[PDB]
Write a protein that binds this ligand. Structure first.
Ligand code: ANP
Ligand code: ANP
Ligand code: MG
Ligand code: MG
Lengths: 550, 550
């Protein structure tokens, strides 16, 4: 609906048309020059030669301005689809991204974008202009000279395309065979290199060389066959074009002898047919990978269509929240991660406002399931969840996400500065608040002990950090978010004792005048809970204070 | 020194020359046809047109037969260098392959071979033929018409190549910028995908999209600049060729007006210059990656030149060996794997013929160093090694390798059938001996319990196997080799007890009437040794039988 893109497309098509027109005009110019020189007074011939030169220069200019304009508009379009698909991809369920246990999604999306761009560019720069050229050639040859010339040029193009189509598959089979042979040789080389200790242990240094030589023959025959068939295809194309040129020139000469049309008219049709024939090898060399581009586009489309999982509901009502009330509770919670495997069943808690509640389990069965469920990653098909009297599934999503904050079991940090990771908790927060939160988290000492401090580079490719710093960063982010409800899922892996008391004190500071749900495996960390819940074989069996022991 | 390759090269060059000659003849043919039709009787014109067609067809045929012949000879050469470099690579020291802790060597060697082939093919198919074309054009234009035509065509080529060289670098800088921007965008996408849990934890789903959009601009500007500069370069080329054609045709017309040369001579020089100009864009599009091919070739050459490490000595005397004698011993052995770190020092053993000697150490300091040294992987610069009174360093290498057999600490198996791995111990061994050895090794029961048996596929990509089967395979290979001296370096990792007694019985069968050096960490495995050697802090301190305790 943007007129700018329509204007650019129209300009590109008009430039294509003008370019084809000038390409058609050029042989007319040459023929007029030849006739003028045959008649002889040289001023007219010089003018026609200058016209020939400027016409072909203008044709090239038109081609290239069309190329530049369409490149700009297409690349802008690629920027729009890529930006949209990125946001769309970051909306699916957690299960899909857990299944996609690789970073191949970025490669897939970029490959699809490049493939779409390549397909569009190849189509608009080859298919339409070549068909337009053929139509203009046929029309001008039929009107200027006769029907026979148009018929013979159409026949020449028909036999050329038929031959190319026939040879393409008979060559791609050999290409596939060579590719498989090369892969086999590479795998054999990998195995021989890997078994080098055993190779040295025995006398087998020449046997591996002989095997590699045999594999080199297996690749050799296919390579030779592919080269030979490529040469044969090129011969077919060139000979077809030669026969076409010879026939058209013979027809022009036969017309000349009768005196129907003037001498010097065969050279124009020769040049015109040849300039028609020029781009048909560029056509093939770009069609070579169009199938792969289309395959990549299909893969991207399928990945976009895996988006059938949508946890968002309709009628997004607002969430009424306040520091008081907000009594998180359950009602007959049953849920299964694995189809038919009751990981969690019969769970129902009761957390009053301002009270710290800690849940403790064994090796683990649903300990992190509470964190997953309360943040609305999965739907508890049985029972319900209550938050200030509001069901999780009956309220607008991202507002619920903003209401409750979580300190995760694990931690991942963006490949940026520490200050950016701290600020990630609240984008519109003042830097002074960020510094105060970081100081409150008991991390500023490690920041000043860092090689740089706030601006030090931390990431996967940055300097490595232990678990304690990541826990401090997560706690500080939770503080910066400032949620009325906090879910601290402390990591199962232990750390230094002093760090444990520091994080315990930090969490005690967090709990002040708010609701906190603690997950831990150490009794000393949960002695301060108002009520403690014990999880056994996926069920709740024990509730109460620390006086219940274990 | 093979006349076949010289004959093929001569045939290819002769076909190239004939092809260029025919390409030169074609415009002469067209000019003769034009003059014949201008004079008019049509039989001569028809004959000249037929000659034009057959001449251009023959020129294409000559090009392509040259292409096929040189492809064959070059690919054969590639097969020779690859086969030689594989054998040369499997001759270096163990340290180089330990340092090369990747399978990238095969990729490097294949990439280098393809790069050498590509460089040779591009050179022989573009540089020489184009220079020959230019020389023939200049000569024929100077002799047939005059010096001015040759001068102007040489000037046109000079300005074309100067413009292309000038624009190449100014475009490759933009190419580098675009490549870096694309890499940055991909890395940002990787980070955003990896931090998806933290993205969902907060409200930051649109912020990542905005950042990706900014990166898309950073890539966008470079892409647009590269497309624009490519279009500008193409305009420069086409306009230069247009000016050249216009100038040459104007000169031909000026010559025609004076009557010095006949009408219809401008079209021949036009077509001749254009067919000269035809391949100069193929030239650039193949030169695009010649630098990368040369870089790969340089990397392969450097890797071949890392071969300065050569443990082989001169004056390879034969090794006198017999089941008797062969008393392996040391004399003040000191060696350091890490420069300045005395891993092994002051080691001197004494193993009489037919006696089983076991060495036992702590966590490990030089336990496998004995296995490494006796098989001549490293040189003990201090002291000497005695084997039947023959120094290891003063005898031919691979015969010493064949004399002594080793059961390794670890094990690796070729990605082939079990029968092939068993036969790898002795290539020229009868299959019946292989079956008898396998049965003696206590493995045929597991073979018949296997899904297939002898022909089952076992490898990295095959079915996985535990350590016990690998140990049985190694023992059976050692039996098939049948060495007078055996060094059994039993793995530090333990296995099933019953498997331990079975392998102990197998080793006891091995020791019969031969010399065996055992390495183990279990006292029960070494109680049967004639004398036991205890290694402490890299030195020998305790020697004797089992009565010495520990
Ligand atoms: N995406 C998933 N699909 C299926 N099962 C899952 C998935 N994620 C986790 N589980 C299972 O959920 C069970 C309980 O998980 P969790 O709540 O983390 O307790 P835990 O991991 O066993 N104890 P802890 O290590 O302290 O968290 C585990 O045994 C997992 O096998
Ligand atoms: N290629 C090498 N370069 C440098 N140091 C090495 C190399 N190989 C081994 N070492 C070191 O030398 C020591 C001797 O290793 P080795 O002779 O295998 O006994 P071990 O590894 O100590 N114990 P075990 O597991 O019973 O073999 C090891 O501790 C290694 O760290
Ligand atoms: Mg957990
Ligand atoms: Mg060892």
């Amino acid at each position: 609906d943007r007129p700018d893109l329509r204007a650019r497309v129209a300009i590109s098509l008009g430039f294509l048309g003008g370019a084809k027109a000038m390409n058609i005009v050029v042989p007319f110019m040459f023929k007029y020059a030849v006739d003028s020189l045959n008649q002889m007074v040289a001023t007219m011939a010089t003018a026609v030669l200058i016209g020939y030169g400027v016409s072909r220069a203008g044709a090239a200019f038109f081609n290239e301005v069309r190329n530049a304009v369409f490149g700009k508009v297409a690349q802008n379009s690629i920027r729009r689809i890529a930006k949209n698909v990125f946001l769309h991809l970051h909306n699916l369920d957690l299960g899909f991204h857990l299944s996609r246990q690789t970073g191949a999604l970025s490669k897939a999306i970029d490959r699809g974008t490049r493939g779409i761009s390549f397909v569009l560019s190849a189509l608009v720069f080859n298919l339409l202009p070549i068909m337009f050229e053929v139509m203009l050639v046929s029309g001008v040859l039929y009107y200027k000279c006769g029907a026979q010339f148009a018929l013979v040029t159409l026949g020449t193009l028909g036999t050329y395309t038929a031959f190319t189509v026939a040879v393409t598959r008979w060559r791609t089979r050999f290409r596939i065979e060579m590719n498989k042979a090369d892969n086999d040789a590479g795998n054999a080389a990998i195995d021989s290199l890997l078994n080098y200790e055993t190779v040295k242990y025995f006398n087998n240094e020449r046997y591996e060389a002989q095997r590699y030589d045999g594999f080199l023959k297996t690749y050799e025959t296919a390579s030779l066959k592919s080269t030979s068939t490529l040469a044969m295809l090129n011969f077919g194309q060139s000979a077809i074009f030669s026969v076409g040129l010879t026939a058209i020139m013979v027809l022009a000469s036969q017309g000349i002898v009768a005196g129907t049309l003037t001498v010097g008219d065969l050279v124009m049709v020769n040049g015109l047919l040849f300039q028609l024939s020029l781009p048909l090898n560029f056509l093939g060399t770009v069609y070579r990978e169009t199938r792969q581009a289309l395959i990549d586009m299909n893969t991207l489309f399928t990945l976009l269509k895996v988006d059938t999982q949508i946890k968002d509901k309709v009628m997004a009502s607002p969430l009424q929240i306040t520091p008081q009330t907000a009594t998180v509770a359950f009602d007959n919670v049953h849920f299964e991660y694995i189809e038919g495997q009751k990981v969690l069943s019969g769970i129902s808690f009761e957390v009053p406002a301002g009270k710290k509640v800690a849940i403790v389990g064994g090796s683990g069965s649903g300990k992190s399931t509470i964190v997953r469920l309360l943040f609305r990653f999965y739907e508890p098909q049985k029972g319900s969840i209550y938050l200030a009297g509001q069901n999780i599934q009956d309220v607008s999503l991202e507002s619920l996400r903003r209401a409750v904050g979580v300190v995760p079991q694990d931690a991942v940090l963006f490949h940026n500065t520490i200050y950016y990771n701290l600020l990630y908790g609240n984008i519109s927060a003042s830097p002074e608040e960020v510094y105060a939160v970081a100081k409150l988290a008991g991390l500023h000492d490690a920041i000043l002990r860092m090689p740089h401090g706030y601006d030090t580079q931390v990431g996967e490719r940055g300097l490595k950090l232990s678990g304690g710093e990541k826990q401090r960063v997560a706690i500080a982010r939770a503080i910066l978010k400032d949620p009325p409800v906090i879910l601290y899922d402390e990591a199962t892996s232990s750390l230094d004792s002093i760090t444990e008391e520091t994080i315990l004190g930090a969490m005690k500071d967090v709990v002040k005048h708010r609701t906190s749900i603690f997950i831990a495996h150490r009794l000393s960390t949960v002695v301060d809970a108002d009520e403690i819940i014990v999880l056994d074989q996926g069920k709740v069996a024990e509730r109460g204070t620390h006086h219940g022991l274990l």
